[PDB]
Amino acid sequence: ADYQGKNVVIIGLGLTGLSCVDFFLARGVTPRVMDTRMTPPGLDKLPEAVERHTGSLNDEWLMAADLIVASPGIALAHPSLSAAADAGIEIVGDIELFCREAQAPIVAITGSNGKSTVTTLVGEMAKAAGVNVGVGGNIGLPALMLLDDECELYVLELSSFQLETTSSLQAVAATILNVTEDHMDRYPFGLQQYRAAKLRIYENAKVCVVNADDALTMPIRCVSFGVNMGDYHLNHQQGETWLRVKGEKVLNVKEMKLSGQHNYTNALAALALADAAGLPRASSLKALTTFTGLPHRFEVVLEHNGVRWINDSKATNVGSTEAALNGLHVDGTLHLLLGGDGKSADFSPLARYLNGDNVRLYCFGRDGAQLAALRPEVAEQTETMEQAMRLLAPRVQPGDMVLLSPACASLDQFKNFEQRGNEFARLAKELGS
Ligand SMILES: CC(=O)N[C@H]1[C@@H](OP(=O)(O)OP(=O)(O)OC[C@H]2O[C@@H](n3ccc(=O)[nH]c3=O)[C@H](O)[C@@H]2O)O[C@H](CO)[C@@H](O)[C@@H]1O[C@H](C)C(=O)N[C@@H](C)C(=O)O
Ligand SMILES: Nc1ncnc2c1ncn2[C@@H]1O[C@H](COP(=O)(O)OP(=O)(O)O)[C@@H](O)[C@H]1O
């Protein structure tokens, strides 16, 4: 596209807004920038040449614009933006700017949970094939920074927020991995409005990769991945689990370094995207055998005396923990650590996994009582995670799992979920060896 002599206004001064400033300056277009916050985090980083307005939006700036570029952190529904829209001022985001310039195919990944896992893994499959792959987007490297004449494949993790402002994506392959209640402040009309944002990812996609077990991932009007069914699925038989693709065995899950049924379906989704993108199968399968997974994502920290200790500290929401529980095949007793800051979540969806004779809950942190209320008869409540671990550890037996998948933010007691996971891992080594 050509922005020569346009009046461009960028809203938001975080990573996105700055990558947009860089993008326009590199084309000799000088944008203006604003942010509703007085001192947004990217303010320091801004070139001195750039006019800026902080502490509020500048409506006269907005209304005089030829193009408004909106960071994903501000709602299109913002009264200032709907007024620009009503003035017929074009509004786009960074992903839109990106798709107009990109000269290599795009794999596009969205969904409530699993995005970074699946995005990373598709990158690893491309790397294993010797492809110059650009991985970025929501994962944390702003997409505009990936733009590179030598790049042969882009792999973009995309949020609902980014998809809302994007109209030219034509992905060689696109997925919604799953849809569970998230960011609901941004979606006052409820689960279907959140879902509808995500569904845009498929428009003009060459292959849609859908989740056979989650209807919400399907266009209302494909290739599928699934646990029991789908083009890409898992096949458990004679004591083994296999990846199946179009009815063929392609890999024994034992050859992967990932654990957890939902990580195996992530592996299937990634494989499906890589196949659609024309990556060689043999190298993609190879990436499945070498990929260790991201830290704190259902991450095995220790297997010893027939007990698996699993750090799923990144599970800060109900949907993540639910996926963890749903895929479990524990021979002995599950010891499940829950709690922290529940962010007013509804924990009911967890309860159906917590029946029968072989589950114990160890609930801690700010909202531990809400989590124990899931099933008080089998729940301990402590102040801290460490206390919970010192209660459960003397009880573990061969065949058991100890799972930290707390369904809650960690911010009431920890710096962040990573500290919580690292603390869990240290205790697990101490108490599990
Ligand atoms: C919330 C969001 O969409 N953030 C993504 C964004 O980061 P960036 O720093 O550009 O964020 P931003 O658009 O400035 O918004 C960040 C925060 O600033 C605030 N904000 C922004 C503009 C403004 O005028 N006033 C204001 O208060 C909003 O509260 C928002 O919460 O662009 C990055 C590159 O594409 C993403 O990695 C990053 O994902 C983070 C990890 C995230 O939390 N994403 C959400 C969507 C998620 O995964 O659930
Ligand atoms: N397909 C999935 N469904 C539900 N939860 C998942 C899935 N894949 C991973 N998770 C869990 O979700 C949390 C975040 O995983 P991650 O790959 O970082 O996703 P995201 O990038 O979408 O935040 C972790 O607890 C992880 O184990």
Side-chain angles (χ1 to χ4, degrees):
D2 164 28
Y3 305 103
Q4 280 301 3
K6 294 285 177 68
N7 194 307
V8 183
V9 175
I10 296 156
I11 298 165
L13 269 158
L15 306 175
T16 300
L18 274 164
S19 69
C20 290
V21 166
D22 178 76
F23 175 84
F24 291 103
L25 290 177
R27 292 166 129 70
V29 175
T30 306
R32 293 179 172 154
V33 302
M34 63 187 67
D35 190 294
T36 75
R37 297 160 291 185
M38 177 59 65
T39 312
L43 182 68
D44 280 337
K45 289 173 178 65
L46 199 66
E48 283 73 26
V50 171
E51 264 201 304
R52 77 293 305 277
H53 181 106
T54 72
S56 54
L57 308 182
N58 187 324
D59 292 295
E60 284 65 53
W61 286 17
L62 292 170
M63 293 301 306
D66 301 301
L67 181 60
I68 299 168
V69 187
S71 301
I74 183 157
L76 278 180
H78 189 292
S80 280
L81 285 172
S82 42
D86 292 337
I89 314 281
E90 178 174 30
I91 296 165
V92 306
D94 69 312
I95 301 311
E96 181 52 27
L97 290 183
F98 176 88
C99 293
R100 302 172 175 184
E101 306 305 317
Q103 299 276 74
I106 301 154
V107 173
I109 294 148
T110 195
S112 302
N113 299 295
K115 294 178 301 293
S116 288
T117 299
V118 177
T119 294
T120 298
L121 189 39
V122 175
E124 285 295 326
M125 283 172 183
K127 288 163 62 193
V131 174
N132 194 3
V133 54
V135 182
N138 195 62
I139 192 163
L141 196 163
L144 289 168
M145 303 181 174
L146 299 168
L147 276 170
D148 202 311
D149 292 5
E150 297 312 305
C151 198
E152 307 166 323
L153 178 63
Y154 298 106
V155 183
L156 293 188
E157 176 183 324
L158 300 179
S159 63
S160 57
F161 297 158
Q162 289 167 326
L163 282 158
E164 286 184 61
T165 43
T166 301
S167 48
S168 311
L169 178 53
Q170 304 178 334
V172 69
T175 192
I176 312 170
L177 297 170
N178 46 70
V179 178
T180 47
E181 267 215 353
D182 194 37
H183 290 301
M184 296 318 295
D185 265 337
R186 287 280 294 270
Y187 299 107
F189 298 100
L191 185 67
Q192 296 303 316
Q193 174 191 13
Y194 175 55
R195 182 198 180 199
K198 286 191 184 285
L199 285 168
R200 310 173 53 82
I201 207 171
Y202 293 139
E203 291 175 21
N204 295 315
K206 170 168 160 222
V207 174
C208 299
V209 171
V210 311
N211 180 343
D213 301 313
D214 187 349
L216 284 214
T217 67
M218 295 170 173
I220 290 137
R221 303 181 303 118
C222 5
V223 146
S224 65
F225 70 88
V227 168
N228 295 321
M229 71 166 33
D231 299 292
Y232 291 67
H233 71 258
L234 310 174
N235 160 216
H236 185 76
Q237 53 175 41
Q238 273 84 24
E240 301 289 321
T241 304
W242 296 88
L243 275 20
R244 287 265 187 180
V245 179
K246 313 280 230 201
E248 309 266 292
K249 279 185 195 183
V250 302
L251 193 80
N252 190 312
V253 297
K254 278 192 219 304
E255 291 190 83
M256 302 168 78
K257 287 151 137 189
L258 295 172
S259 296
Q261 179 180 92
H262 58 307
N263 273 330
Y264 297 152
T265 61
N266 288 339
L268 293 175
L271 190 60
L273 294 165
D275 285 341
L279 294 173
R281 170 65 62 74
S283 57
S284 303
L285 285 187
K286 177 87 186 183
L288 294 182
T289 63
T290 66
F291 183 51
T292 50
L294 295 180
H296 309 108
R297 275 73 164 189
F298 204 82
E299 174 184 17
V300 171
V301 321
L302 172 72
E303 197 175 350
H304 185 75
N305 282 142
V307 191
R308 300 166 80 214
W309 303 68
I310 302 195
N311 169 16
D312 194 29
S313 185
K314 181 83 188 290
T316 58
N317 62 82
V318 168
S320 287
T321 293
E322 157 151 22
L325 300 177
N326 178 71
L328 288 187
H329 292 94
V330 177
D331 283 301
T333 293
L334 167 75
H335 308 264
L336 170 69
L337 294 127
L338 296 164
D341 179 4
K343 301 169 281 180
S344 315
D346 171 18
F347 297 109
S348 334
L350 300 181
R352 46 170 305 200
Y353 302 102
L354 302 175
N355 309 315
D357 280 351
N358 303 101
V359 189
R360 304 292 182 273
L361 314 175
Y362 302 81
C363 302
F364 65 87
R366 202 204 298 297
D367 299 335
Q370 271 179 33
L371 282 122
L374 272 55
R375 204 191 162 185
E377 320 87 75
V378 300
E380 303 297 339
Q381 278 184 70
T382 59
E383 199 195 317
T384 65
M385 182 180 73
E386 185 170 357
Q387 286 159 341
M389 305 202 63
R390 304 197 183 278
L391 210 44
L392 69 87
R395 293 168 186 178
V396 304
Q397 265 160 344
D400 290 1
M401 174 185 295
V402 175
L403 175 58
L404 171 67
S405 187
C408 290
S410 65
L411 290 202
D412 61 312
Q413 286 174 316
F414 300 88
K415 213 164 112 288
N416 52 37
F417 70 83
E418 289 101 321
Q419 187 183 56
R420 181 178 61 193
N422 293 341
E423 176 168 331
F424 172 82
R426 169 174 63 81
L427 292 174
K429 296 181 178 70
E430 172 204 340
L431 298 165
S433 308

